[PDB]
Each structure stands twice: as C-alpha cells, then as structure tokens.
C-alpha cells in the first residue's frame, strides 16, 4: 500500500500532537497495550512486576520505554514510507535480540490509535484515523519483509 502526500500530511499533523508530549503519550500507549495484552507485559523483564495503572504511570522505566518507542516511530513516520534505513536496526533489536511477532506490532498499533482518539478527538476524525492506520500498516508490512530478509518469519 502507498500513502499520498495528503495522507502523509494527516499522519504528521496528528503526530505533531504526540510530539508536544512524547513521554505522556508513550505512557498512555504502553499502559493501554499492557492492559489489553498482559501477555505482552510479561516480555518486559523490567516492567512485568507492574500490577496496576497507577504503578505503570509512576514507573520511570516505563516512561523511558515509551519515549524510546515513540522517538523511533516518529522518525520512521517522518520518512513518509522511505524508511528502509530506519527499519534495519529496528528489526534487529526485534528479530535477533528478541523475537517480536508482527501480531504484537499490530496490538501496539491498536493502542496508538486508541490513545490518539482518546487525547485528540477534535484532531483525529475518520480520515486521520484511516491515514494513521494506513501508515502503521505500511510500517508493519515493511518490518515483516525486513524480518524475513534477516531470517525471521515474524
Ligand atoms: C507489542 C509490541 C512490542 C514489543 C512486545 C516490543 C518489545 C521489545 C523488546 C522486548 C525490546 C528489547 C528489550 C530491551 O532491551 O529493553 C525492544 C526493543 C526496541 N523496540 Fe520494541 N517492542 C514492541 C513494539 C515496538 C515499536 C512499535 C517500536 C517503534 C516503532 C519499538 C521500538 C523499539 C526500539 C527502538 C528498541 C531498541 C531499544 C534500545 O535499543 O534500547 N518497539 N522491543
């Protein structure tokens, strides 16, 4: 799938709102992810002890993870699909070091969409939601192919 310039503009318009508070969005996205998929929480050794939302919001380590993830994702989105340079190191942190299935990236994308709608409904209507889902689908498609290229089926 291919995004138009106008679609990329909707994605990056929304992403500008994330960049106004990267750490807080990162917290809310990981918390939503861990609440929907506690089996994913178990894969973070430094976070899997966190048993409540209040604990997760207090965790400096969780906040650091959120910033790391959104910083990398933001760099990827700003490439508007021309992101092969960014996907290679990311696949390796994910496809050799650990084994992060594509389905987990799908769950992560669902949490992003949820948090964007929860924090910015007035700037995140149907067109913007579709465009963000399209950009995240392209991310997942291309990281899946990068996985395979490195010898991991995802
Ligand atoms: C449910 C989805 C995901 C899971 C379960 C997951 C899990 C992990 C794990 C276990 C590590 C290495 C553990 C560590 O050394 O701390 C890691 C590294 C990393 N992940 Fe993810 N990840 C997910 C989604 C994402 C997404 C969507 C992005 C960015 C678009 C991302 C960006 C990174 C980066 C940049 C690193 C390297 C961090 C570093 O070098 O310290 N992750 N991920």
Residue 5: Cβ within 10 Å count:
7
Q: Method of determination? A: X-ray
Q: Which of 89, 116, 101, 154 is nearest to 15 (CA)?
A: 116
Mutate to test the pocket of ligand 1, among 90, 142, 152 (most ligand atoms within 8 A of CB): 90
Distance CA 23, CA 20 (A): 9
Contacts of 67 (CB under 8 A, 6+ apart): 22, 23, 26
Resolution for this PDB entry, in angstroms: 1.5
Distance in angstroms (rounded) separating the CA atoms of residues 92 and 110? 23
Distance CA 96, CA 26 (A): 24
* Ligand 1 proximity of 112 Cβ (cutoff 6 Å): no
The candidate with the shortest Cα–Cα distance to 94, out of 84, 105, 85, 83, is 105
Rounded to the nearest angstrom, the gap between the alpha carbon of residue 125 and the centroid of all alpha carbons in its chain is 19
Distance 30 CA to ligand 1 centre (A): 11
| CB neighbour burial string for 64-75, b if at least 16 within 10 angstroms, e if fewer | ebbbebbeebee
Distance CA(15)–CA(132), nearest Å, equals 9
How big is the chain by its Cα radius of gyration, in Å? 15
Q: What share of the chain is helix, strand, coil (3-state, %, to 5)?
A: 75, 0, 25
Atom of ligand 1 nearest to the CA of 44: 10
Q: If we measure between CA atoms, which residue out of 128, 154, 108 comes closest to residue 7?
A: 128
List of residues 6+ apart from 130 with CB closer than 8 A: none
Tokens of 102: 């594509």
Q: Which residue is closest in CA terms to ligand 1's atom 22?
A: 100
Dist. CA 56–CA 1, nearest whole Å = 36
State the Cα–Cα distance between residues 148 and 70, nearest whole angstrom: 24
Q: Shortest CA distance to 65 belongs to which of 87, 84, 86, 43?
A: 43
Quickly tell me which residue has 């992003």 as its tokens: 112
Q: Is the shortest distance between the CB of 105 and ligand 1 below 6 Å?
A: yes
| Residues 52, 110: Cα–Cα separation, whole Å | 21
Structural domains of the chain ordered from first start: 1-154 (1.10.490.10)
3-state secondary structure of 11: helix
């Amino acid at each position: 799938m291919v995004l138009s310039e106008g679609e990329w503009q909707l994605v990056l318009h929304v992403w500008a709102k994330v960049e106004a508070d990267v750490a807080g969005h990162g917290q809310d996205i990981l918390i939503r992810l861990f609440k929907s998929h506690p089996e994913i929480l178990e894969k973070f050794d430094d976070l899997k002890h966190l048993k409540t939302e209040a604990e997760m919001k207090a965790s400096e380590d969780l906040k650091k993870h959120g910033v790391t993830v959104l910083t990398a994702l933001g760099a990827i989105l700003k490439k508007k699909g021309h992101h092969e340079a960014e996907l290679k190191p990311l696949a390796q942190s994910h496809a050799t070091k650990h084994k992060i299935p594509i389905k987990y990236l799908e769950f992560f994308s669902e949490a992003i969409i949820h948090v964007l709608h929860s924090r910015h409904p007035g700037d995140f209507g149907a067109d913007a939601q579709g465009a963000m889902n399209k950009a995240l689908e392209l991310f997942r498609k291309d990281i899946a192919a990068k996985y395979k290229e490195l010898g991991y089926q995802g």
